[PDB]
Each structure stands twice: as structure tokens, then as C-alpha cells.
Amino acid sequence: DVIYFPPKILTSVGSNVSFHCIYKKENKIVPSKEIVWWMNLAEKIPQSQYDVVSDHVSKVTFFNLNETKPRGKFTYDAVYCCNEHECHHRYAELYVIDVNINISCETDGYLTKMTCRWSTSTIQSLAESTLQLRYHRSSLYCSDIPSIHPISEPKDCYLQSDGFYECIFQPIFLLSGYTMWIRINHSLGSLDSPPTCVLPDSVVKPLPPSSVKAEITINIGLLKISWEKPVFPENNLQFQIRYGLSGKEVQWKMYEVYDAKSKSVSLPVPDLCAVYAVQVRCKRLDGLGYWSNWSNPAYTVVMDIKVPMRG
């Protein structure tokens, strides 16, 4: 008695969807003037979106659709074509899912691996759908101009203990463009994630510095801490050194040098004879990169600095 077209719709969040309906009763067609639409058999769609095409067919268009809650076994939504008296049992299914899944990864200090991950456990709008990554390496830099980007090829990676699907790459180019996205397929159709790119050179996290040493200067009273420059990468960078009074819990404090040339700094301490712990952290001067993992703890030996003033 009611024919719907299109019967099934699968779009993304914020899309713009249209539907049509034809209603007949007692072998007669109700004119499109009296046609109203019901959503989920709970709330009535306002007449503002109602438009008339002819004397027999009336269409409706939804604006800025939201997500669909998982309601028991059923995972879809129902839209009805109704006369002001009755409503037929035939409904048109409307599926919608989110495509905003973040991506981010760091060029390891070895400059040989580039591993990152994509999680979907938090997302509930998808179920029983295969997921696969796509990427592309042709440009030297990204963000030059938006492009349609038709060319693509598949890849493969596996699930870990956590739901965050990590994937490992093989030798990469430090200066190249890598635009990647996820894809969606479903029984009704297919979708894809919004594009984005990451520059391997600007996302390098340096390895923690080694051979860190600290010792209070003699007849000076200035705590001098010595370190070593991380081998990779070669760009100019800034040092953050974090230190405090050694113990089970340490009242840490923060001081940060903006010059890469300097390799040791002196600073007076409040307690002249006490165990002290220092730590070293590294980051890019320009701000493009990741903070390094914390160095090994470093200590010193308590021993007399100057002559006692009072006997």
C-alpha cells in the first residue's frame, strides 16, 4: 500500500537526506496536501520541512541528522509516511554513523619505524563492519592545497590487547607527504574518514639523553648538572631539567633553558648537604615534535664544600 524510495540510506553525521512517500487507501490516492511524516512513531516532524512535488508524491528533507542510539537488537531508525488518521506498518530505514576518528603518530628516534593506531571501541554506531586503512606517499609536503585525492591502496595491521588498533610501517621517508584515512563498508553502502596528513620530520621524538651527571661545585655553592646531546635528530632544540631533594617523595621544581649551545648550568641550592636528584627531558625548539621519555635518575655524594664559618 506504501512504496518508499530510496528504501535504505547510509550517510555521515551532519549530512543532508531526502525521502519520498506514496500513500493509497480504499483504492484511492490521498493528495499530497494531507500527507504528514512521523519519526520513530514518537514525535511528529514539523511542517516546515514538508514540501509538495505533485498531487500524489510529497517529499521531506532532514537537516543535520544526529547519531542513532542502539535501541536493543534494532540499530536503525524509522521514518513514516502517514495520513492524519492512520499510519502504515512499512517504514524506511535510515542509518548514520560517525566518521571522526583521530589519528596521530611519531617518527621514532631510530628513523626506521613509524607506528600509530586507530580505536573504535568507544564508537557504538558501528557493528559487524570491516575496517581498513588507506594511505598515500607522493608529495614532499602536505597542506599545500586541498585535493580530491582519488588514488589509494590498501594496507594491513592487527588488533592488540587494547582496542586501539596499532599498525607498524616499514622504512619511511623523513621528508614526504603521508595522507591517511580509514574506510567504512556496510551492507547498505560504504563511507570513508575525513583526510589528514602527518609530516614525519616534524613529529620526531628524540631519544632520552645519556651520561647525565650532577655535582655541587666546590668553593662555589652552585649545583652544576652535566648532560649529553641526543644523537637523533639534528635539529636545534631546548632542554628542560627537573630536579629536587632526594627522598621517597620529592618537592620537584622546574627550570628551562632556551639555548641549545649550553651543555651545563649552575644553580644554588637551599640545602648544602643533602641527597639531590636531577632529571633531563628533551623537546624541539620550534615546538614541532614530542617530549622525550624521562632520563635515568642521577644523584651525587655529600661532601664538604667550604670552610665552616662558626666554631
Binding site: D1, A78, H88
Partner: protein, 146 residues
């Protein structure tokens, strides 16, 4: 068992089933008097007064719910069985015999309807059952005849 205990137990069971129905995520606000062209075999709409029609509509509701394999429908059917038994006990206490109603011959038309659509059947059946049980609670106070 005293008759008053059964009388209050009927109301408690009706209220419990109504509260359970009011928990499903589909039928929060779908109205109990909605008219659907195809779904006409589901009992409801017009009120009922006699116990014969009472057992009849309860049996039709039980059988239409039996077709649904959902987790939260099995418990409703289980409670409906006890409700029907309590109704039979009350009818016996009213000194009138009520026969165990058999399968309604119109429920076999549900085969096409269920395959064609399930969401409409779910919503309409749950809403009509809730409305019929509210009518149950309202009517049982007057203590009508068999």
C-alpha cells in the same frame, strides 16, 4: 489462601508488569491509542468488561509475545502466565467456570507482518499491552461479573 491476598496480588502484578513495560527503550512516548492500518488483529482500542474477553485478550497477547525472542519479552510472558492463572483463580472464587481459551485463529496472519516489519509490531504490541493493563487495573476495582 484468603481472597483478599489474591485481590491485592493481582494489582501488584499488574503494576509490576506496567512498570517493566515502561522501561523498554522503544515505547517511552508512542501513545496507546494510535491507529495502524495493517496492525488490526492486536487486541486493544475498545474496552472490555467480561472475564471471557479478558482471558481472550490475555491469551492473544501471550501468543503474539511468544513469537518475539527478545530477552525482555520472555519475562513479560512469564508474568502474564501467572496473571492468567490468578484471573482463573478469581473467576473460580466468583462461582463461575471459565474455559482455558485456545489459540486464536487470526494470529496466523502475523507471519507476513512480522517479516515485513518488526519495529512497528514491537511498539504497537507493547503500547497496547500497557494500555490494556492500565484498563485492567482501573476496571478490576468495580469487580465485574464473569
Amino acid at each position: 489462601v484468603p481472597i483478599q491476598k489474591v485481590q491485592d496480588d493481582t494489582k501488584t502484578l499488574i503494576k509490576t508488569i506496567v512498570t517493566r513495560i515502561n522501561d523498554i527503550s522503544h515505547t517511552q512516548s508512542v501513545s496507546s491509542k494510535q491507529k495502524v492500518t495493517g496492525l488490526d488483529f492486536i487486541p486493544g482500542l475498545h474496552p472490555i468488561l467480561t472475564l471471557s474477553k479478558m482471558d481472550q485478550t490475555l491469551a492473544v497477547y501471550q501468543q503474539i509475545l511468544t513469537s518475539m525472542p527478545s530477552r525482555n519479552v520472555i519475562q513479560i510472558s512469564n508474568d502474564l502466565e501467572n496473571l492468567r492463572d490468578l484471573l482463573h483463580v478469581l473467576a473460580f472464587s466468583k462461582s463461575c467456570h471459565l474455559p482455558w481459551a485456545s489459540g486464536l485463529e487470526t494470529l496466523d496472519s502475523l507471519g507476513g507482518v512480522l517479516e515485513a516489519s518488526g519495529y512497528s509490531t514491537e511498539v504497537v504490541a507493547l503500547s497496547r499491552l500497557q494500555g490494556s493493563l492500565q484498563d485492567m487495573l482501573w476496571q478490576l476495582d468495580l469487580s465485574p461479573g464473569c
